[model samples]
Target chain A: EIVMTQSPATLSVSPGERVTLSCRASQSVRSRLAWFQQKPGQAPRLLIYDASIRATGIPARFSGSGSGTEFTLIISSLQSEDFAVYYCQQYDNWPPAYTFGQGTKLEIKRTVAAPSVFIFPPSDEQLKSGTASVVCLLNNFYPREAKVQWKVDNALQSGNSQESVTEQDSKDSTYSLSSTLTLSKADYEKHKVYACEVTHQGLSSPVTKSFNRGE
Target chain B: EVQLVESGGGLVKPGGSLRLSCVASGFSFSIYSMNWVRQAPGKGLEWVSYISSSSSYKYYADSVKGRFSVSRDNAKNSLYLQLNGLRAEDTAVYYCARDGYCPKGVCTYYGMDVWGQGTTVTVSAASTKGPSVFPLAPSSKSTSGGTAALGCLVKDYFPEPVTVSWNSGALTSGVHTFPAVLQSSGLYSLSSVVTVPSSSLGTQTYICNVNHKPSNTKVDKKVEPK
Candidate 1:
């Protein structure tokens, strides 16, 4: 086990004030990064990764901005539900070990309006040339609780399909979820539209959106 | 919610060994590492290393494995750490804890959150092996007398090569002929010799103490300067 520790043990911050947390590494751990939030008697929830990329469904207020062993877990506008603890973890290897900063407790300054959620669109990838394919990275996205769809030229691809999720340390449970569709190379090039609908308990309607092949 | 509710006490045996356990609950047995830690009465915690339930992967923090051992019964969700070959300095309490794991993609995390109560063990009879005539009945004390040589055996099942030290008390300068080394199941044994003028034998005590991973303190002997 690598030595993991947190400083200050506890902190107090007024609402709207910024609370910065530092998660350090004993050795140089490259790339692998994830942030989480946990309240008493609760499981940790993923916040951000690869640095600033927020997890799907994560509020924009909860943002990460750092690299390597040092980084910060920033909550822009602290809400009542946000009055918990935060920790950072590195997912570069197994022993599948993880390090958590002692955790910086956020003390709200004043009551603020509730935070609005954002929609993460379904990602699409096609054979670009030889082996190179455009890619899309999704963060903190809980699909089972949402909807993900594949559409080509406005034509929705439907029927029975399988999906999967994986985590860096899980022997069985995948950390995140994913789904894929198959088609002939010729058909792949012809089809152009795709959308991921995130339908949850709270939402005006299905949070549906789409993305194209990236470079 | 993994925790090590360690037992606590300090026994004053001129010769004894300390064994501590970090029993756990509310966490999966096969997922995290269990470690043994020691603290000298009131000193900060020191890591002894970790033992994995899967394939029994053992990581040590010192030089003698025979001096310490970290064994566990997954069914009971408990880990057992034992300090064999005891000395007077091994009088501090021992703590059992769950060492951090590699979360996401780290090798493993440092720092232990779940801690067990401390159990103290003191050795009642242990001394140097000198060159006196061979005794017939095998007494608990040493058969060879004159210069005192101590053999400290730490159970390797706990971790490899835990740090072992010899003190002359009152900060006197003395040289130890040999240091500690892991000699198996994660066990290590080391020997040290201090020339005891023969007159001081049986009158004075030399302590061989140990510190390892997962533990929170140091175990040592308390004596006046000779």
Candidate 2:
């Protein structure tokens, strides 16, 4: 099997700026390289195949070049929708093995936004059950990446946390995320505190919200 | 409101053939391209073929270069996958997906947003093989800070049931192991990814361990940060 490697990892560019993404195979793959664009929560869409030929309905601004072990995906003019992760795949191996590059993320420059973090305490009805569930919501954030953690009285919570897929807002193009934590009734009766902490590129310090039992 | 329903999948003997269909609804079928992706039971996804929205062009993966064909009918809003020279490896669940965007007057190719429920095809055979594991180059970036993703590919296995684990300094979180996919050559292949903190990347090495139950074998591949 051939190893596919993508360079730069992340490219920060403004809208309308030109960008070039690179993919290199460990050995010659001839013209069997293909490029795909993937956004959050969406399946990959093919852009270029056969090394340099654009796929059907692909925009002219997107082009591919190079053969053998080296390939490039060039965006002549970046549009707002083109800011996503791009991956290169090679299909030159026998026994029919295909490999993909790690992916190169094209990010918008200088417009990062911090998430507005909110934690919803377990309802009284939920607290009556053996287990109580708390909800943490992060709304209207940019760049589509954020770290969320749950802590019980400053102790990190593990395995009892569930996170929803990050969804992009159609109107503002920002992202929203949700996380849930489940605690035992014994812990809730003991008056343990629960906290939701979020870390993002737009913030110098982690944003946090805590839920006290009596409050 | 867009929807796709797949049909025509069932038991097929070795060396037989079948044609699968995807009927689309609630959208202009001729304006959006359709794609075919398949997964063998307990395997990863494989891109098979795709037809242009206008039915003017078609593309196929090298793995299915000659044996598989893709065609579309605009009037019926339907797409088809024709498979020939079937084998045990061809047993899989075939899914039809829609991709392409028409904003303003021009259409741009993006991602597949709509997909069918998928239909299953099984070819009866008795075979067993071990897996070969390879570590992929780690990604330099991740969804957020202090984290990086490492990947490992396990290929050429058979009879399903493979366990893949990552041995970083400790048991890692955010481990994702994709299902094994059947390749055109009648073998199964899959990938697993593990997310580790970026702080531990340069200072330590990560190992991918694969256990193939059928062949009773274990393979390990180690990757070092670049």
Candidate 3:
């Protein structure tokens, strides 16, 4: 089992405070780090992986970039989505059960009147199956040089990609990507494989699991 | 494009009952299957089982009969999994998972996987919390007929929602929840209670499916309620 360390068990800060978290492996589970968000009453949301790249439906404000056994989870602006407890887990090590990097609770020392950009998700109920697709897109990402791949059921990418989108949402902003992967229901359910990763700054890869049916 | 919004906590008592719910939006509940996962104490992951409106499946290591089973509401598209006879060990993080077709266990690059945000179920009382006595004694032997009421109790729990069921592998029809009562009204996991029938209590082995998600997640447990 991979020993994950998440510093400062609990933390408190103001609304605008830039929130960041860290997850270090005992040794190195290769590239199997996944960041999840757990609020008081909702289920967890996947935020970061492969040391830095963000997951689908994830906002640009939430940035990830790290390498080797050390990684970081940075929240540029605390959105409602950022108001939960963040945990890091590894998929590469299985026997001892997927390891969770303790967890860091993000609180608002001073309330932000803007409602914060955080979006809350349900804690107990999630999608089981259907005929839809998820498109995880990121732009204005940090650490200019990076390669992204997808993981399904705790494994690394077996395919390749050539299309990546990059643009400036505002002045002095730039973005670029190198790879992407798509999985159908067959790739997610039957295979127990669900995750996409990005590598840059020379980090191994990250791992994330799809919403399961039960345990 | 679909999103899930679940309810809050509950104040259960010993020998009492409970129920919980998850409401879905951005899509029709009928269009998908809502699964349940139980994170037992001290483990990272486990698979309890998944359910839908038409039928249910239970993942018990020993047997799959009586007591623990999966179900759904066809009209609501809302998937439901109820556990009767609450035990102190039932307390853990219970999540609703979405089902992905990527073979259920390994990893893959497909979409359409069943995923869920989880809800927590805390067992308040033990001696006072469990299956209510039906007054009738359980059959001394299996006549291949009649009914019974068995008990499910977990010695403890940590971060996981330990699952307990009675099964023999093959999927069998059984009650999902029993003795669940109402707290504020009809809302679940909020002092509300529901239950299953005694027919499932037949002279059969029950498996306690202690899983983190229904499939391809982590941490799981099964009990042969002898």
Candidate 4:
């Protein structure tokens, strides 16, 4: 196992401020650094790897770059939810275990924003597949966390849906996510309306919208 | 050198299910785990999942974690990915690669360096198109002689490895081709620039031919000065 070190112990920044973090290996590790972001109380999420390629759901703002021993993680612009600890893991050392650097906590200061919602209807082509799927997009929410639920004709749908990992939109100062619901074409043809519900502490009430098959 | 190959049903209905398998050869299967990589239409690459053979440990990209599952058959030295509720957008070529080495009681390192031939899953019966070759800018007068570029944009196509050619023009200089690149939408686009003296600008026309070799189909565009 290789010993990894992270500096500054913590980062203090305001929303929209550009920040950069560093990860250095004791030896030549080549392009073997992967960065992860962890909320104060949640599981860590892989952010970037192969040095610079952003991982899935990782926004364009978070970037990783370098080769050999020195690697850097750049947050072109920080968002409210980005105020979390960052860590680097190196996977090149040997019959050695993967080693991670000491966490660098990002302390953030920003005002919050309530989430706005939009629902998209099922398309006209689903009759060919025996199923219909549509998305509900939740936009510009601050504090970075939100819950999404789906329904069909007022009944909760616990399955057959996919939710995207929340991503902070670069153009806006808030976070957004999309949840997709896939239903039987029969239900769609029956003209049943599907609903998407978004819940966030910032909103006084959950945002809910419904849609039907679109011509 | 280990060789890996993938297999699966090529056709899937939208909102359907699929299971693709990757079989590895020339290496001890129990010793290494595998990771999955996918490419759609002209879109680039997406990493989907990885599983540790010995520990059954797994990590999936958020984009695919909800609908994708990865497992392995240690006895057969193979890895399997099962997807649920797939959509037409889910059509793609899936590949498997060996994760770097880690021994029991040793260390845990991550790497995926060896790859298998891709197995494709397609949702719709789609058609292929040869390139729509055209000149982005007509041949024009310039210092340092004359220069303009012909762009071959191929969109709404299927199964990669598309090629484009520049022919039918006399070159007072040299011809250069930018490599074929997969577009964001999963189709392909290629461009070739023919450089010649300004004297040849209006006197000759250059032809660009786009070819989809697997289908042996092609389309041509004649590029001339405005």
* Top DockQ hit: 3
lDDT of 3 by residue, A94-178 (tens): 3223456767766444221110000011111112332112222222344344444555456665643223333221232334332
Off by over 4 Å in 4: A1-215, B7-17, B37-47, B54-59, B87-95, B100-126, B134-145, B148-156, B168-191, B214-216
Model 1 alpha-carbon miss at residue B202, Å: 52
lDDT string, candidate 4, B135-222, tens digits: 4223221112243333233333555556656673434233444434444444444444444455665665667776777565777766
Scored against the true structure, residue B162 in model 4 reaches a CA lDDT of: 65
Q: Comparing candidate 2 with candidate 3, which one achieves the higher lDDT?
A: 2
Best by lDDT: 2
Model 1 C-alpha lDDT per residue in residues A142-185, reported as the tens digit of each score = 22244456555677667522333222211211122333343445
Error of 4 at A179 (Å): 33
* TM of each candidate vs. truth: 0.31, 0.51, 0.37, 0.44
Report lDDT (Cα) of residue B7, candidate 2.
Answer: 96
| B-chain TM-score for every candidate | 0.45, 0.54, 0.43, 0.65
Give one digit per residue, the lDDT tens place, for model 3 in B79-194.
55556665655666766665422233333322223345666666653222222111111222111224332222221122222233334334333322221222221111100001
Order of the predicted models by TM-score, top scorer first: 2, 4, 3, 1
True contacts kept of 4: 0.00
Q: Pick out the ten consecutive residues of candidate 1 chain A with the lowest summed lDDT.
A: A130-139
Candidate number with the higher TM-score (1 or 2): 2
10 residues in a row with least lDDT, candidate 2 chain A: A164-173
Question: Which lDDT values do the candidates have, in the order given?
Answer: 0.46, 0.73, 0.44, 0.64
Residue-wise C-alpha lDDT for candidate 4, range A109-140, written one tens digit per residue: 44578755655554333346464556565555
On the 0 to 100 scale, the lDDT of residue A58 in model 2 is 90
